[model samples]
Target: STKSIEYYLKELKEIFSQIWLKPSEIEKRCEELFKRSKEFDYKRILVSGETDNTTLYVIEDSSKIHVFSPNRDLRENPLLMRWHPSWYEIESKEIYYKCFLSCEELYEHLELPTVTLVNLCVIENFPIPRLNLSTGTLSSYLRKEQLAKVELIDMQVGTTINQIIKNLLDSQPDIIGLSVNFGQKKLAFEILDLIYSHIENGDLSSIITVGNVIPSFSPEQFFERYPSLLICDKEGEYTLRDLIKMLKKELKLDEVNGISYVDESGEVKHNVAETVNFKEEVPTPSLDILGEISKFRGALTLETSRGCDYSRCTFCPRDHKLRSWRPLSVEQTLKQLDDILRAGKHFNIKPHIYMADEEFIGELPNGTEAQRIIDICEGLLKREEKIKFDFAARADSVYEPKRTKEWNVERLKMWHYCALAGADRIFIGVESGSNQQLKRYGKGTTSEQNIIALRLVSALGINLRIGFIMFDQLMKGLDNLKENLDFLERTDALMKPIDIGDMTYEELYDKLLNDKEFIEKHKTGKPVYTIVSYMLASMEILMNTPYSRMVQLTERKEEVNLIMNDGKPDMNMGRYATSFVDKTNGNLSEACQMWIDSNFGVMYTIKSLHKVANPREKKKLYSYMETHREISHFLLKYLVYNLSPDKESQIILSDFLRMHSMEHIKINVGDGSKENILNVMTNWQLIMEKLLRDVEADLNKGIITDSEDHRLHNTLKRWFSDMGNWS
Candidate 1:
């Protein structure tokens, strides 16, 4: 009898780790529950949910189950039937309405379906919580919907596929949603097939199932693979809620927006898309309900704004029909932080947050666009928690006031207040520094604007991670590569000599180079090693984007289209549509991609832990990262220049090679002056592997962290194996 909870208590040992809870208190509470459970003679007792290191235990007796949790969401679960041999909800803060009913009456009860939002595709280890804001935001909406109860479960959290399925079916959700990002269909298929297996074995009831991007973008291709799966093409909040209402016979399915399901004749019926009033509909994602988010020490993520009005990037994947921008009010944003701190306190939430917004600076509902960010930061400063946070934004947004011709200099300095309110970093998509490449990519920001944005953000003492796509279908020549490397390496000449007095925008034209004060303020702390993330990235064409159609038209079939291999959808690493314009650069990108694929494990671990790191430790981590990035960057530049037909490029490469900071690493290229990039990359990859071993040795230190280091070992090979090869 005591063994039941002792097992659970022990499982929590690795997580809670005597840091959050006392042994005496946990023992006492477990004993009290052990004594209380003697009355029921329950054969099995398992932890259902957790708060403050204490658990909400679920006890089982044959078909009947009892959940004793203070969690209000868990109290009125539709899975808890009123039948004699069914689930019983223990006492909670709110009253759970009860009704007396026979089996027939219970079957006909008007309560809506038990909806479960599942995130099986999040690439992380168990329980080191990375909150899926999709489920969190959707949970708040479903609660307001007042029909079905929504349970958010990240299927990766400490469970096997079978165990996860059993746990899921025990909850008996009527609707289960599998969230899919850019290229995660294989895992989705595994989860889907497992559920179907259980259903075939009569272990589960008939339930609605689906995925997001893959489902919506390439519906037919995916549909041919799986029979009964429904697709959430784009926006989910309103559509899912409305779909639930339709399931209860309140409205017709045709009225629902952005949902797809096959009819009786096996033809998929699709609903048109509608722009959601984000302020009116989507509330702040419930951090508390999404498990103990703070326990993992990862930054909590929330969307500050939705749908970019400037969503015209040819390569970007979005709901094709939805194009707009709306931000959460300041009051609403402040409340979001307060709730995070409150939820974080019990679990000792680390003081780092990440705004998952595509556009960090947006106009407020009051139209006080400039003042809004200032107020938001000022409001956060008043809170008990002093935090460091960051978000992603367009490079053009950094030069916003200057580009828009701001009269008041106060607006230009608004980002300074953001620093006071824990502005740690800003991620900008500086796709390329070549004007031609920028135009080809449909990046509205110019080479000058991007450079100015870089200097501006870097000068603020805020760290920066820029997204640079080194290889794309437009990889026609060495021009973009030189410019990309020049900007990435923070070389002075990479910037255009634009006159800052020039301003032509409101979606017009602008410039930022050659401003002496601006240059002095936002210059690069340029390390010769690498610019942003350790590995240079290649473009993976997303399904249904303008770029995808372009790739199709170019007939770059064999080398391009990473997602499909010889006409079959791999649904693994190549989930993105990709093609190459120039085969020479194509060969270089292919040779270069191996480094990222193999090194991604260490890269991900370092970056994830970097969020919660202390200031001094941050530099230590960055230094280690700098050294590794040095290796990757040196190797790439070597190959790039080696292939260049230009004599100046050859001289630049020679000069770059001599200035290597990771002096310990030296490559022998003289013997083989003209080696194939693939052959060269393949052998050097072992050097990366050796470097990985070195990094792994350091992971157990203060930087690697006690909780996440163990996860690193478990998941290190995960990316390498899954994403390393198109085969």
Candidate 2:
């Protein structure tokens, strides 16, 4: 008994660690629980539904589950069922009420099905915590698109089939649907046992049974195990819809496009039909039924496409069974908006739409086919001025803002135009910057293609969120971490040039990770790597770049605040270097105080070499940063890598800087031959070598040995040392 208690305590600690938490807090809490549990056995670990982290421990050794108030230090057995066994079981009750309100508002706008809906309370056998991985909300989102009235049975995992049968018998619905996603083999027998027991006990009802599974794992086995139930193999959202359609009418069995149950000599058999067309017209779902809805970036999703077009990634399951991308026609989409506006009289939501396109303007390897998406966009924009929606597009779309008159504007315009057409943002897949890595994963785009797509969006003033992979080690033992970082920073600088005038690099970085929705869609890796990369990238941009608020202190010395321990400003080597230079100039303004107090003196001399070098610099501050004496070659790399949103992201910046910066340096220093430093070295190897050498020289010369210097040195060493370590 004590071991069981200890085992649970350990599991809690492990789970907490997996998320983010202080170890000491976990140990302290675990101790308190252990001490309390001596008097009463804890029944369950309570997790908050939405937040997921707000957890509590319940002791149910007595007649029922006991609740202990952590704040009040009071214990009481409240007769209430709050925590679900897992994340999936916990439905947001508020969502249902909100949907009801939306329905009431839209009742006059759209027509509803006249058929009497049968409610079958379906129970997921897995615990509530595990439900989070089930994609139920996404599934439900798609379900609402098709008119399906689903009554959920939120039950625990240990529930027996007999109890399930009893509950169903009591409800007495016309049909029965089961969530058979996990532990499916044994579950069939349990269902059989319940059915036979019901029959032997003289309780019988003609009810059709149906089941659905995620990822369609082991379809043959699933069919063989439960021949009687309608087995849905893939994309159950539409399957459920077609099932309902087939059942509502006496249609030929083969005519149904999803699945249905069959009776063969008192035995049941499962039949799976080809997926139905997602573009088919279905009555708008009764928003009255959904329990929780999501509002992202001040907009709600408007499904524009079902499934993905580029489902060729080797490791992705998209290839196995659900590879096709089905997009709603522009006309159909416009009609949905008309119906919505007509129905709800009140635009309870912002005019934000999410076009769930796998590939907006398809650019398959064979090249884009004949289509008029631009005309489609123009049509939608003309249809309603009140609507703004976002869509997914391949980076390779033939029409960009500049390429087209409507989309042509400074960066972030795609968001604006797509918004004009009721699209707010675009989700693009940017698998890798390395062609080798891209090829390995069977990602169709090249590094240059990704750069082009990203930069074009930046020019159009669109929020370009990317989707990449946490690929396994490469065959070449190549580590693209630094390259990726460099690209991302440069991309940020280029795309967010608008931010240059207002937000500090620190603010921009902070916005990207925490405040901006972009990071939510991106930012993946093992936990420690994720945090470290986040901090490092933030500091790289916030501190090192002249565009950064702190770097602005090098010249203006009046527009930065980096002193507060609680401040979010990144103080990495590059940023701190700016801080150190400012401190040498004495007390700085409120904005520049933190920057002046940092460690710039060691890494760079800030030598005011000459006038701003030739060609007009992009951010005026770049000319100012040029004044810094012998800046870290790393600084240039930092800019090159991070400023990927540059005017020419497709042209390797390594080549650009080698050719351009060196030319600028030579022209300013009155030299000509070294101007060609841009052409000599090609990849990161040469740049990294120089940085490492600089670090060694700094270390040997007893120059700039502050915390910032040490930190910079360690990072350089790691980057260079582990250059070819990651696959």
Candidate 3:
């Protein structure tokens, strides 16, 4: 019955012979025959320099067998899974023999170190996110090389520390970098506190690092706080890119630059930053690496330049740091913008790019800086993709170029054309409006000139976002305080919209500031404090600046805990201590901060709503905000202007503040009246509630994340407490 194939076929092949088999057993029999019938004996063999993972095997009739860490090992590493963007197509079949492994995995499946770059300033969790173009640019730069896989995270985009921790544990990075700005050091510390919990538990493993404006100025502070951490001195893409190679011992640690670390002797080693051709070196961001475009709140960011042209501002700590002043060519600039726009093609949120150039204009070989920017605008206007952009320019940059002893008609064409090219917002750093303060701050512009810049931009319907310093080391008198307030009242950003962008500078100046129908037609913007961006920022004292040396020359020590006691000093060189002109204005600064922080909830909501709300809805929001602004300025002026040091007077400052707040609530916003304070408050509450309900619905439907906080918190919960000594 053990017949041959010929005999079985002749017998119709239905015979149940002595060598009979069941249905399940046939597969086993066939597999045995398949094993016996192999042309070449093929045991899984190691493909030289190829992945240990078998999905990408070369079965070219070759017989071989093959098989393929927490942190800081510097020698033994994790197994790398080979992947390429081209691998998804699988059509690189001819190149498979030549490219068995990815370029980064050429070291016998040695995985490239993982890195995560975080933008650490999650002050608000709004839909319109402020994409950290600084961090984003570094991310794309790192990813372009075969050095590491970098993950970009922005804390400002409503991202929580818990989610970041969860993501870190899952991704298992070798290094995590936090980019902390000026006011975000304390928040960054809190985030670091939560992050360390996982590291201690071994749930996540990475060497922590910090960079950007904060750490660069305070290297020793970070060195004292965390001995094991690496501090990026100033972000140099070349420095960070080669760091991964240096991490794996392919190169020595000495090979990398622009990094700070502690040596075996417990001393900090701050390596010098390498000079780079910024335009070519800092590549256009591969927006694909940003993951979901919606997370950026439709913020398409591009950095066309580095540092500031006018780096002599005394209050700013970035004097030498900002002196580099490199700007891209007009053609290169548009190319980057074009890529970002295409990346957000189908995004739900409307795209508005905030160009993160410290100085948008450059000292060109042209007629003027304004002319170069105008040329850029012309290039953008020629493009098919219509977009809105916001960029920062000094007040002098706008005012000087626009005024030919009075008003330059030739240069005025720039702003007119920029408006047509979708220049929605222009930020002018009008730090102080008073002449003395402006001179002290070295801003190089007068109060009148700053006002001119604001009026011109506002007249063109371009939003005005300003930088103002109300509390500082020099404000010893109420007159000093009153001077700044007077400037605010003057440039309250009230303007009449006329076809004036094309008008001669003098003609437009007459139309903008001329008293013809001025009171009758002029009104405050949708958001009244458009003239001021940072309302309560005191001049922060940071090291390595003229202002810091000036304070040291005065020998002023720490005043109070108001100076954001970020960390204790090691040798008194770490923290820059800030004392006020006197505690009178210091006390005022503290109370004002509370007031602004308290109002931030409602004010920010109204702003977020303005982006998407209907015209009628926006009007209601504006009305409530106008009343809010009235209360803020009134209290601020009363507190500062009336601050008296004479113990002879029986007028309590707290009593005045309390009574004034109550009066505003009573007279301006009557209780329980239609659209009054209580009524208006309830309307905002309803708006927030509806938004939360919609968010909840989307979350339930798996359309969005539940990470969004409908209001960052209750807007009015702290309102009662924000009143200083009201009880």
Candidate 4:
């Protein structure tokens, strides 16, 4: 039998003295609190209001609670208030009181015999289990550098946010470290908010701290909003070690470096960034510490180097003096991999490793970097447990080294050796196929270089995952767009999974952007289509990069409204304008929207085929993809050529030029251009008609069985509709 709300209210009234009963109304407030908390097994009602801004929330059986009003002055009676820290014990409370003076006091009086720390990294479901090198690396440091008890939580491997919070509550950690990157920023904050709720309700005791890229980029904002959270500015390994010392009372809060925390007066204080001795300070990670969670995982992430050697890319965040491309010695790299691999054997799960370097394999200029990789691969091959791994490399690095304006065969042999030594896949940062766009982005390599390197990597029998920005702020007239599309089609770049992204502006300006003079020196003079550029996939303007400083000074006058996380476009006028040419003959905004729809549709259809169970289904899907690919090529080519001349004349002239361009073919009789054009057009027309008929027939037959398949096919249909509308 379910108990009534009144019964719960009566029980709370008898147990606690703080259930305020206003003279005007006591029953109404009690009923509201009970009703709100009726869903949970345990309930606590909090009420707060200064100017009649009253709010009530029932906190129970949950990680977080939202309350409009909170009891701020609840801490009264110095003796009892002091007793809060000793809630978990009935023994001497004197020790906790002394510790509370220097450390931030937890509202929850819960105490543990020893201070505990929990470090977490979020993992989204993917083909392989994600072992975040950030937290994994931190765990290694904590184990070696510091001796304090710490619980490591990897959100992957079927762990829930609720379970994580519950575990933190049960353990009553004195400090919690959240490791966040771009991918896990939102989730990190969400989990932090849950932890804060427990702090509000006096259920758990902990001081929260965050590290990694996101926190480093926006420490001030993070500190301002989450005043309770300590921000590890940069060099997380150093900052975290310092933080542990402060928590243990070995060092005062002010003594710590590369850390930011709120003081008693509600002011955020930042300490100077800490430095580390890279050679000796780098710790070898131990996966054995993760216990059962580390058992069923793939893609064991390892990093042999720190920072990028090529940090010249204008829009990159890694552009700093710290990016000196420091790599571990071959001996150290071998030892780390051997340790991780040996540890995995205990769980009976053989894990493939992925090097988490900003850039992989270097050029002939850096022989040691390349040699280290080769030696690691050779070492892995020699091991009884043969391992396969993937890595990222600059496109220019894949080619044969130039020997006084001539190519070197030794470089080619080097790559062939790498492939044979279990190098399965190599991710190349081929950001653009157009030299113009590449130059603008400060990519020193040319389009020809990208093409040659891609072809070479493909020939080596190793998989290639090329990274490209399909569209960006620099892409203007139809010709530029055509160049990008042509490059992708010619290279068959989409054969492997490609990373496509849009230009993103930072929410706050840090080191680089804060410097007013830098932006004036290098920003582009062309009127930047900031609005349309953001909508189309492009690049990131990192706060610490030279390009961001340039944009800050030059484009300071240009207003960009803060696009919130709600995922809605602000319809405010004058804030957004576009100079982009749309193939739809519509506004650039509409074109970008449709482009996103079409791109996602194609992306998901390909993603779905990766999971198809039936062999016949997979074959049919491939056939559908092939047909779609051809149709896209034809449509894009027509669009590229049709604008200069009328559609009919362009088709005739294009075919003629194409025929003449074919080296094996001969055009006799006044170049025979007209005759060649006529023949090509006739064939093309027939091919188009047959393709349309075949596609229609395929669609008529049921091609989907499951819900995901149906959705993917429907998305594909929408893309086809847009292609027809793109005339």
- What is the C-alpha local distance difference test score of each model? 0.60, 0.38, 0.57, 0.51
Write candidate 1's Cα lDDT for 1-727 as tens digits. Answer: 4465445445444333232232234444554554554554544433322232123333333344433323234344433432233444455454322322333433333234677777664444344656678677776665443345566766544445566687677877777777765556666777888887877888776445565555666677667777666777767777777777667677776676677877679898988767667764565564543343443455567787787767778788666435677778788778766656555565666667788887778644555766888899999889876888888878766675443455223444566667778888777887777777788788877777776676555555667777777778766777788777666665442222223333432211222244555454434545422446435778867655676666665665444443345544334432454446676776677667766666666676766666667787677667767667766876676676556546765665556445632223233442233246655555445555555565566665544553434656665556445442422
Error of 2 at 68 (Å): 58
Please, what are the lDDT tens digits per residue for candidate 3 over residues 1-727? 1233223222212211111122113323333432443443433222111011111122223223111111111011112223333433333322111223234333433245778877766465344555466676676555433345666666666567777777787778887888877667667777787777778887877768777767776667667666777777776576676566566666666567778788888877867776556765455564433444465544667888887767888876662255767777677777667656655554544567888887887565454666667878988888876889898888776667444644345445677778889988788898987788888788888877777677667777777688888787756655566667667766345555556535565666565555556523654443324457766577866667677666655544543343334523222233465756565566666666655664565567656655565676566555555555555654555444333333321243235335533323122321222223223332223333333344345335644322246442344334434433221
| True lDDT of residue 221, candidate 3 | 63
Which residue pairs overlap in candidate 3's backbone?
Answer: 44-64, 44-65, 45-64, 45-65
Q: How accurate locally is residue 8 in candidate 3, as Cα lDDT from 0 to 100?
A: 22
TM-score of 1: 0.70
Off by over 4 Å in 1: 1-112, 122-127, 197-203, 288-292, 363-367, 400-402, 407-411, 491-529, 556-579, 595-624, 645-727
Query: How far out, in Å, is residue 336 in model 4?
Result: 2.5
Q: Each model's TM-score, in the order given?
A: 0.70, 0.41, 0.66, 0.63
Residue pairs whose backbone atoms clash in candidate 1: 455-522, 504-509, 505-508, 541-577, 561-578, 562-574, 563-574
Worst 10 residues of 4 by lDDT: 503-512
Q: Which structure among the candidates has the greatest lDDT?
A: 1
Candidates 1 and 4: which is better by TM-score? 1
> Measured by C-alpha RMSD in angstroms, how accurate is candidate 4?
18.3
